Design a protein around this ligand. Sequence first.
Ligand SMILES: Nc1ncnc2c1ncn2[C@@H]1O[C@@H](COP(=O)(O)OP(=O)(O)OP(O)(O)=S)[C@H](O)[C@H]1O
Ligand SMILES: Nc1ncnc2c1ncn2[C@@H]1O[C@@H](COP(=O)(O)OP(=O)(O)OP(O)(O)=S)[C@H](O)[C@H]1O
Ligand SMILES: Nc1ncnc2c1ncn2[C@@H]1O[C@@H](COP(=O)(O)OP(=O)(O)OP(O)(O)=S)[C@H](O)[C@H]1O
Ligand SMILES: Nc1ncnc2c1ncn2[C@@H]1O[C@@H](COP(=O)(O)OP(=O)(O)OP(O)(O)=S)[C@H](O)[C@H]1O
Ligand SMILES: Nc1ncnc2c1ncn2[C@@H]1O[C@@H](COP(=O)(O)OP(=O)(O)OP(O)(O)=S)[C@H](O)[C@H]1O
Ligand SMILES: Nc1ncnc2c1ncn2[C@@H]1O[C@@H](COP(=O)(O)OP(=O)(O)OP(O)(O)=S)[C@H](O)[C@H]1O
Lengths: 307, 307, 307, 307, 307, 307
Amino acid sequence: AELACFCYPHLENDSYKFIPFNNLAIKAMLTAKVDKKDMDKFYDSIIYGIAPPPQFKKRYNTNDNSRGMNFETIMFTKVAMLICEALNSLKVTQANVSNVLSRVVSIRHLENLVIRKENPQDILFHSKDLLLKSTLIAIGQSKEIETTITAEGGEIVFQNAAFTMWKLTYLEHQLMPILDQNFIEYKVTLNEDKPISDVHVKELVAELRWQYNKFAVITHGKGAYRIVKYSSVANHADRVYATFKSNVNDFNLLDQRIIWQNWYAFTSSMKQGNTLDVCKRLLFQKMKPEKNPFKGLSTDRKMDEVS
Amino acid sequence: AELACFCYPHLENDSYKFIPFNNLAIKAMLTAKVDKKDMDKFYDSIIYGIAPPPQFKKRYNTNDNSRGMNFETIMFTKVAMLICEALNSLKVTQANVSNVLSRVVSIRHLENLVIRKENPQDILFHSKDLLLKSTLIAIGQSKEIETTITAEGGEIVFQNAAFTMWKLTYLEHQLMPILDQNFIEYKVTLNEDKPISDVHVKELVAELRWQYNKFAVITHGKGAYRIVKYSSVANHADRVYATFKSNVNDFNLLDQRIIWQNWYAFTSSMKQGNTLDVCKRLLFQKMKPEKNPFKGLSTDRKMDEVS
Amino acid sequence: AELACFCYPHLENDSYKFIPFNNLAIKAMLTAKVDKKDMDKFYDSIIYGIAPPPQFKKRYNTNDNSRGMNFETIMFTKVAMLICEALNSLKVTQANVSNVLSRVVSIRHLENLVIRKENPQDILFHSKDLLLKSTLIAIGQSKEIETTITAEGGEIVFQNAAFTMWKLTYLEHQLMPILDQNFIEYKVTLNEDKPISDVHVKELVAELRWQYNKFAVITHGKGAYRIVKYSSVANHADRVYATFKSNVNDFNLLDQRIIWQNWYAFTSSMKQGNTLDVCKRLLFQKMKPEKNPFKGLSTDRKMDEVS
Amino acid sequence: AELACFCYPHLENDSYKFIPFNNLAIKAMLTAKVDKKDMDKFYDSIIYGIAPPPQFKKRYNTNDNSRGMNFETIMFTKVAMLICEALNSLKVTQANVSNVLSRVVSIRHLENLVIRKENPQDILFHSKDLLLKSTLIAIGQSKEIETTITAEGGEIVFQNAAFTMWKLTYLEHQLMPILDQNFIEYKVTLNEDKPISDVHVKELVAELRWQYNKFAVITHGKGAYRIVKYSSVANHADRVYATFKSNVNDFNLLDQRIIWQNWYAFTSSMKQGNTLDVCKRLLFQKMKPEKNPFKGLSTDRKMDEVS
Amino acid sequence: AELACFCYPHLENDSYKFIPFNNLAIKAMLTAKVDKKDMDKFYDSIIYGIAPPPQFKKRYNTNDNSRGMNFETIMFTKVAMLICEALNSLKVTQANVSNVLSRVVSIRHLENLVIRKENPQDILFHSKDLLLKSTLIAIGQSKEIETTITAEGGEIVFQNAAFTMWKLTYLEHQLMPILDQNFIEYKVTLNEDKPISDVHVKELVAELRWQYNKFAVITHGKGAYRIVKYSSVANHADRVYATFKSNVNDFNLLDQRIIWQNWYAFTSSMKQGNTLDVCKRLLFQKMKPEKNPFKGLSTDRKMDEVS
Amino acid sequence: AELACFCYPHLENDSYKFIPFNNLAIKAMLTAKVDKKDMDKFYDSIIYGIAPPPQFKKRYNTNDNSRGMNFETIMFTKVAMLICEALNSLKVTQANVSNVLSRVVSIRHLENLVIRKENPQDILFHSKDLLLKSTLIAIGQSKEIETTITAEGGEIVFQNAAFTMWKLTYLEHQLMPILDQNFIEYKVTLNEDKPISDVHVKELVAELRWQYNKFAVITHGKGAYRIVKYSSVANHADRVYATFKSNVNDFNLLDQRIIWQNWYAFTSSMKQGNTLDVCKRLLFQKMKPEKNPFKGLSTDRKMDEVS
Ligand SMILES: Nc1ncnc2c1ncn2[C@@H]1O[C@@H](COP(=O)(O)OP(=O)(O)OP(O)(O)=S)[C@H](O)[C@H]1O
Ligand SMILES: Nc1ncnc2c1ncn2[C@@H]1O[C@@H](COP(=O)(O)OP(=O)(O)OP(O)(O)=S)[C@H](O)[C@H]1O
Ligand SMILES: Nc1ncnc2c1ncn2[C@@H]1O[C@@H](COP(=O)(O)OP(=O)(O)OP(O)(O)=S)[C@H](O)[C@H]1O
Ligand SMILES: Nc1ncnc2c1ncn2[C@@H]1O[C@@H](COP(=O)(O)OP(=O)(O)OP(O)(O)=S)[C@H](O)[C@H]1O
Ligand SMILES: Nc1ncnc2c1ncn2[C@@H]1O[C@@H](COP(=O)(O)OP(=O)(O)OP(O)(O)=S)[C@H](O)[C@H]1O
Ligand SMILES: Nc1ncnc2c1ncn2[C@@H]1O[C@@H](COP(=O)(O)OP(=O)(O)OP(O)(O)=S)[C@H](O)[C@H]1O
């Protein structure tokens, strides 16, 4: 959803400070009869403050919408406040307020940051600087690449001198969980954005083949690996393409010894400018088996097990 | 009930400050043997403070009274305090204390104000001035007309540039709910007491015919519409008449394009001084169908639905 | 689903007797690796009997399918037995077994018949002849028209000398309920398929305008009225058209004073052979208001209420 | 309610056999649109059998009626069957069917008989003859006087060689309990309708003064004492009068040493033909204290206690 | 129990300050092997502080004692603190510490004072002076007479210009409730220890005969009436005698028009110095009925009821 | 455990009929003081019948034994009866009774047969002949090889024209479940003990690599595959060896293209007569990768997924 679904602008000494919406003001808005000429204008509930532009009605779950977010939960407020604390430290101007708020961000990524922020064991609970950087990345107001320190978090299922593998807890989310109960997905972040040895790539690749053999190692190109069911690569190919198509934009293919062969092809075809069908095609054909970089990984792990 | 059911007067530097009753002192009073010459005098429980005049015994629910209020709930205290905070800001004199306290007010209206007052999302939670004005109106110590800002509240089911429609939550009240579980009623307040366009009246009327076709649009004449079941107009006619009969008094017929035809007649007959039977009669006859002000409203909404 | 999802054929003295599937045999089948040349052949579980042809896998809900039926419930068995008791009384031949079983029937309609069949207050609980006729109609092996006696049932919300209005209890179904919790739909059956007076049509039409004003009176053309939300007429138009398109077929427009104006147009355009767009178009335009057959109905009911 | 609220007549070999109503047929009826010329005619639900004449709608509790009976409980069926088993043994004729069914009987009295009938410890559970006589008395098709054997039952709180005192369990009834939770009432039946000694009257009177001092000993004149709160004598006086007024009739004043002084006066004034006001008046005046028949009773019981 | 069951002495600047026992130190003590020469000496648990003299083992409930108190409840601590706050304000000396602590007090009376003390509606919650006086009376370190203000409290069932009647809530006590579930007892305190009119005595006596006819009005002679079951007067006679026998002492017969005839006799015989048998005898004989002071009380109340 | 833990012999007309033990007789036995010369003799409880020889005390779980069985569950009885129904159909003689009962059988295998036997969907519920054969195999009184029809059962996770793969439900067993909650194990039975094509072996092998990559395909040599965690092969190697060592014996290596390479080696070394260390050694070394029989299986399944 747009950042304009969580807060509204407010002039306060030349600078713009962002304020969170009360869920009841949103509720009033969803029952309000607005003019087509005001759908893009914030709404005054009179009783519970300002509400989002009524043109975003589809972002909030109601009795006939389960495709939006659960704005009546406390997580909506926590997430809104997180976005506000971030935007407030930018001192946006009377000309970006619009561009900034119309930005679409990942809700699951923000709620995941709230979970990190509130855990006193998480480093984010203690560093407003790290928390800030983590959030700016998520709301698209940063140039940095998400790494382990600034990751959205989740449950750690594998740690290496080079990477940290997380199990995404979207099914358990309060704000906008995933409805498909068969959902399983993992994210691998780079601990440090520096040179990674072969022994550390081999340690990870081995873990991925043995522990997650039914998963395809892909990437959305922003610096982290995404471990998803093969029966889901298609949908990912579509979303990443649609995104690339938005030229109006950098992509990181990541380590080719880790990314699934077909995904690397599909993505390189895309980075070369090709069409969708041309790309998608590559993703389906049983390409020529590349020279396995780390052979034996499977057998070794298997033998260790046997002891 | 009388305001004297929630508090008692107390001289404190020439001015009169009102104090709330402890529920246990009320309980003692209900078991007390008082003299007919003291029924109008406050009662001393000796143990829990001062209690209301024993002549009001019928206002409190007991084992043989369900026609009163649940004074042992916390809502009784919250409501009492609300009344006290209001009266204390008037600095009543040694001659009105009686007149003021003998005033009958709507308990459901006060408990509704407590619910608004305690919600941090409601503007009343932040404006003691607005809260004050809202309460003074309710306890009859104000000249202002209840509008959206100062309304008793409830659940907002429709908002317009001109009105706000609330669903009265009386069934859920702790202090003195409605016992009839088949009860449904809505209130429409004017957002601003100023000139209202036709397009905004049409937006409301359309909503009332489509969404509440089994409801009659009436008014008790204090500036707001009351949406009630047709099978309840009779009782309303009686209560509003009885009230008018109390000449010892202004009435607002409100917009004639909104108020149910028969109700407007019944009320105008009343504002002209007529009798009850003369009025009630008008309310039952299938009067001549007036020239529909906004024709087509029904069909339009219906067609929108179909898309 | 196809009737072949509930039972399988079995030669037994020249005649074909149908046997119900065990849910565990279906489960085995859903885990079975079948050859593309056997997808249309019944499956042997070896342990729990015969299962349906694996080409119907999509009819049964699993961890990745919620678009099918809950075959593990007792209702699956009850429904299967109902279908079997019906087919067994036909003595199908070695040439129809296929045609008969490949017939698609409404599961909600069958489960509704089980609910009637098991209630000792329902006449079906006592007439295997009426139960039979009711089921044959539902499984498409009958020429008769569903009337009140043979209806699928539900909760009776209005009864007339001529019609009976039922509230469809699909949300509560065990076998294949409706997932959309905002679903509300009613069915009106003719008590007797004979001449219906005007006073009895007027009694019904009045009830439909007052009690169900937000509902469009339509029909799927098999002899009964379907009362659905206007925001659902579109989907109905599609399903009825798709069905009509299946020329490889009779349609009953029903009483034109009852069916919604636009639906009658949409359907007559269809009975004339027209295209989809040509028809659908009629359904959206605010046609010229036909001469109201029973005027005043609204006001009368309203006045009765007021007493 | 009328006996016609539980069953309907049916010719079966010159005699009339009564059949119980299905609760669902009653429900259909309550939603049926009947003609004013058929309100007194049984109703055909088409689906659940015959229902009572729609003119009795007020006898059944619905969403807007709590003044009737809970016909959907099993007790409705049990009670209906009890009434049927009784009427069926009378072989009513083609001319009384109406008179018999229009008879108003006490529902609480019948449900009380069902409770006795189903307890294997109660003699009624074993004597269909005694059960029959008990029911005929209750439905007004008998000349006998209710005594201990044929009483409606309840909880036995005192037994004497001459009487049995029962605590009426109406608050616990399923079919038509009493809604006023402050209700307490007892009934005293004569074990044998023969000469009762003074020592046995004294034993009872003593128990009534010591154990039930806040209760007035009255009677509805059908042979049993009714022990009710003094704050309820008024309502009883009205109901017994209204009943007496129905000349279109015998009354038993019962033992004058037991019946409350004022009640005996009120009732004798009634048996003499007087008006209501003339009677009611007697009930309120502090009449001249009659010569206490059994003096000392109080002190004795008190002294026994002290040991 | 002795006050020495709740606290122990401690020299602190010439004065003696009392400290509460930890329940765990009591528990240790109950498992301790003490010498017969130390049974009267406080016990050191080493781990949880000082405990009471092991000679009081019988005051605490254990697995084989239900005749003591539940020292592990919070009420034990609250009660101990109440006793401490009282004794600490006396500044007892190095010669009374023993006499003071060996004093037996009523636990139910103290726990009742804790309940008053903690209720913010009770005046004791606000007056440490009144709380103090109330406690000193209870622990026998005061000359004052318990009146309504300083009563042990309970549920108020009747209030008069002169008296307040309380229902003792011993069954609900945490520290040392009454085990006999059939227990019911009331206490009547004098609001003011001054001249009481006849009309106010008559108001009370009337309430006692009508509302509590099975109760004997007695007194333990310390200024308040005790309303107990006649089947309990005997036990009371014994306890009051045993107490009187403790000459090593003033008694208040109270109003003779209120106290049960026999109790007044039994007590006057005692105040004259007589033996137990001589007294007890008076309590059983059906003495000559004294000239009823307020005749008619019964009939009046009865007549009021009837209206 | 020994079959002598479930029943005892009894001469009845030259033949020996087996009777089940009452759990209470076992309990008595576990508290009985027996002589070392009777430990092998059945025990008479006197009160609950005959119990097992006290030398088997270790087979029953008590307060200090969790290594046995839960003989107090109904499953103990059901299992005992199953064993009895089997032995009774053999008509054992006065010379085998001992040999037969001292036979150790798998309890989990028997309880699994009870679960099949009681399910009306399972073929065993209908064939006492098949049930019999299945049980005789399990208790070691049969020459037949367990196949799908006669398998111990469980949850079917894969079915082929040639095999059926079951998930062992030992964790859920009542009689003697597995305590290690991390336990997962599957069994693959041959549907028919006949020639199996390559396409059907390939279908299975593909399923085993994709769906169970962390599992080693082994066998205990009685005709079925056992799918266990690699971290469990060691324990299996020990149990199968210990068993082989019991020469006082046939082994089926099964299809070498399916059994894990190392397991085939370990087992062939055993079938050749070798020692334990010699065998175990083979199981650990990373043997030379044999020529993959069905290459590509992995990639194909993976590609199918992607569609
Ligand atoms: N309802 C939705 N649920 C999930 N994704 C959506 C939804 N709607 C749009 N998207 C897609 O979200 C993006 C892909 O999913 P995300 O996980 O949100 O991307 P991402 O968070 O940037 O990826 P990472 O974290 O860098 S590996 C595509 O740009 C969008 O097409
Ligand atoms: N127990 C009662 N319950 C509800 N109304 C009562 C009751 N007793 C008296 N009334 C009536 O209360 C008034 C009408 O109901 P209310 O809703 O309280 O009026 P109101 O609150 O002033 O109306 P609004 O808010 O201006 S539309 C009549 O003056 C009284 O007759
Ligand atoms: N999953 C589905 N749920 C509901 N309807 C479906 C579904 N799939 C197909 N249909 C449609 O079912 C038919 C319309 O719905 P139904 O209620 O089943 O028809 P119907 O039961 O014959 O109508 P009646 O009872 O005569 S008014 C259309 O022929 C189909 O397109
Ligand atoms: N809803 C009602 N509840 C109780 N009584 C009613 C009700 N409606 C009418 N009655 C009265 O019922 C009768 C008195 O109550 P009942 O207890 O039913 O009489 P009764 O059962 O004949 O008295 P007994 O058993 O001989 S002492 C009066 O004739 C009626 O006025
Ligand atoms: N376990 C016990 N339970 C109750 N009373 C006891 C117990 N043991 C001794 N007593 C008696 O307690 C006294 C009478 O009971 P209490 O109610 O405690 O007296 P009291 O509290 O002084 O009376 P009041 O309050 O002035 S009317 C007698 O002096 C004792 O015999
Ligand atoms: N407590 C125990 N739990 C499991 N197995 C045991 C236990 N005690 C002994 N065993 C072993 O049981 C055998 C192997 O386990 P099982 O599964 O019972 O064999 P099995 O049932 O014959 O194998 P299948 O069914 O033919 S593949 C070995 O012969 C024994 O060493």
